[PDB]
Design a protein around this ligand. Structure first.
Ligand SMILES: Nc1ncnc2c1ncn2[C@@H]1O[C@H](CSCC[C@H](N)C(=O)O)[C@@H](O)[C@H]1O
Lengths: 16, 475
């Protein structure tokens, strides 16, 4: 199993 | 000239810092914000730094750059595709599970490289940069783009000059999304970006630690739009050197891969300190190399990346469900849901791919429709804990009557939600079939159509299950 899977363009919260 | 821009940005900051307007005024507010932004955009010169020529002219250097810093450059090439834009094409047969792409940390653009870049002092002084890693990465990208001799210049000069995120949509392209869920997020995006610009411009014009930044001379709305759209299109979460924490990063070679359904084949190697990607499938020479970005919805794809994915196996819609406090059985249902690890009221997802509802949503619906006796059976007795443990399993229903009730409720709810949309499914299909529209308009209409299609499939699945359990009950 991959210990750190990487998501391409993962969604983050942009509401500061 | 700078003072008029300052007045416009002050007005934009004040309007974008007001509380959320009521339902129905949202759209208006959006348009209002658009207006102001457009004025600001119309008095500026677009991107502050542009590179003469076309993007492909810069792809060799990138490769060369990557090659000279320990990245894999053997086995693929940068190629334009009609249906996907630029991407990786295999020059040699690549077997499935074969390690074919790796990018060391020194090539990446992270929040850590932003803190130790020219942005360092302002980052140490600005609260929003400290709280928002993604905005910090966007400004790192902006600052390095305006630096003539940046280490990441070969990578920046290969980035797109525009995107198909809703920040680039014309107003009538956004109007297609009215009465959807996604449009609200669209609103959010716009508002956020606008506010942030009006904030940071002010900061850039006053704070002393930004005077030696290349942004003090020119910092346009299109600059910030490009930065944030590049980041939300290409940001990734990676562990730090020790692995104890997480940070945001841009991965130069690997982020040119396009998307297809599959599994995540990209992980970080801490020992060799590099991102690594193995082949999603067998790619013969001359075949395009795809990866699987993630289990994101088409709404998220459109809003944060700029494309609608047909046959998205992970597509879903939000649904808001909770137990009413007027229910005389509210306390028992709340206790059962708590024991099952499920909130009493929350947002669930309706999926297109079977099953349309998850185990979480199924257990919630079953508790939502329990009689007082069934709740007692799930709260007291030796068998109670087992029954609540099978609550999310389709194979172990509470009772046929409970299933009939819950599937009836779900069908009715999905049909009502369908009734709340401005257009029907067949209207959208007719428009997509008979009308030629912009790429962005096609994206918006396919998005609203996908929402309603998920709802319709939920309706039909709920009806079929209701009939199945009614028939089992009749025998
Ligand atoms: N499966 C797909 N179908 C259509 N467009 C895709 C796609 N996968 C990726 N894209 C496009 O590629 C972008 C992700 S970054 C991938 C590289 C991009 N093609 C480029 O030339 O720079 C998205 O904004 C989207 O526009």
């Amino acid at each position: 199993t991959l210990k750190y899977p990487i998501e391409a363009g993962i969604v983050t919260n942009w509401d500061d | 000239s700078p003072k008029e821009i300052l007045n416009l940005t002050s007005e934009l900051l004040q309007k974008c810092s007001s509380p959320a307007p009521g339902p129905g005024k949202e759209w208006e507010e959006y348009v209002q914000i658009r207006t102001l932004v457009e004025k600001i955009r119309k008095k500026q010169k677009g991107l502050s730094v542009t590179f003469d020529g076309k993007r492909e002219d810069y792809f060799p250097d990138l490769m060369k750059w990557a090659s000279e810093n320990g990245a894999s450059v053997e086995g693929f090439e940068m190629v334009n595709f009609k249906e996907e834009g630029f991407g990786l094409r295999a020059t040699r047969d690549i077997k499935a599970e074969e390690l074919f792409l790796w990018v060391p940390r020194k090539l990446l653009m992270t929040v850590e490289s932003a803190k130790n870049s020219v942005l360092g002092p302002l980052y140490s002084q600005d609260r929003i940069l400290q709280a928002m890693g993604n905005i910090a990465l966007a400004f790192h990208l902006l600052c390095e783009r305006a630096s003539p001799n940046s280490f990441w210049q070969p990578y920046i000069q290969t980035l797109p000059s525009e995107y198909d995120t809703p920040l680039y949509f014309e107003e009538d392209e956004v109007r297609y999304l009215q009465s959807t869920q996604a449009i609200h997020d669209v609103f959010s995006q716009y508002k956020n970006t606008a506010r942030q610009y009006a904030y940071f411009y002010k900061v850039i014009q006053t704070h002393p630690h930004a005077n030696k930044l290349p942004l003090k001379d020119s910092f346009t709305y299109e600059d910030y739009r490009w930065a944030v759209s590049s980041v939300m299109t290409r940001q990734n979460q990676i562990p730090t050197e020790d692995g104890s924490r997480v940070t945001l990063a841009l991965i130069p070679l690997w982020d040119m891969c396009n998307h297809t359904n599959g599994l995540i084949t990209t992980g970080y190697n801490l020992e060799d300190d590099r991102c690594e990607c193995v082949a999603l499938q067998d790619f013969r020479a001359g075949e395009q190399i795809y990866i699987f970005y993630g289990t994101r919805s088409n709404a998220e794809f459109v809003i944060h990346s700029g494309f609608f994915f047909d046959n998205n196996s992970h597509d879903r819609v939000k649904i808001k469900l909770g137990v009413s406090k007027s229910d005389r059985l509210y306390a028992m249902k709340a206790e059962v849901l708590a024991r099952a690890g499920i909130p009493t009221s929350s947002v669930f997802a309706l999926h297109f791919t079977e099953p349309p509802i998850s185990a979480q949503l199924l257990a919630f619906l079953r508790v939502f429709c329990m009689t007082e006796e069934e709740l007692k059976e799930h709260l007291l007795g030796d068998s109670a804990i087992d029954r609540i443990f099978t609550l999310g399993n389709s194979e172990f229903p509470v009772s046929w009557d409970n299933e009939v009730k819950l599937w009836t409720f779900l069908e009715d709810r999905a049909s009502l939600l369908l009734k709340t949309y401005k257009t029907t499914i067949e209207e959208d299909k007719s428009v997509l079939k008979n009308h030629d529209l912009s790429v962005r308009a096609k994206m918006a209409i396919k998005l609203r159509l996908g929402e309603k299609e998920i709802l319709e499939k939920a309706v039909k699945s709920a009806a079929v299950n209701r009939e199945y359990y009614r028939q089992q009950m009749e025998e």
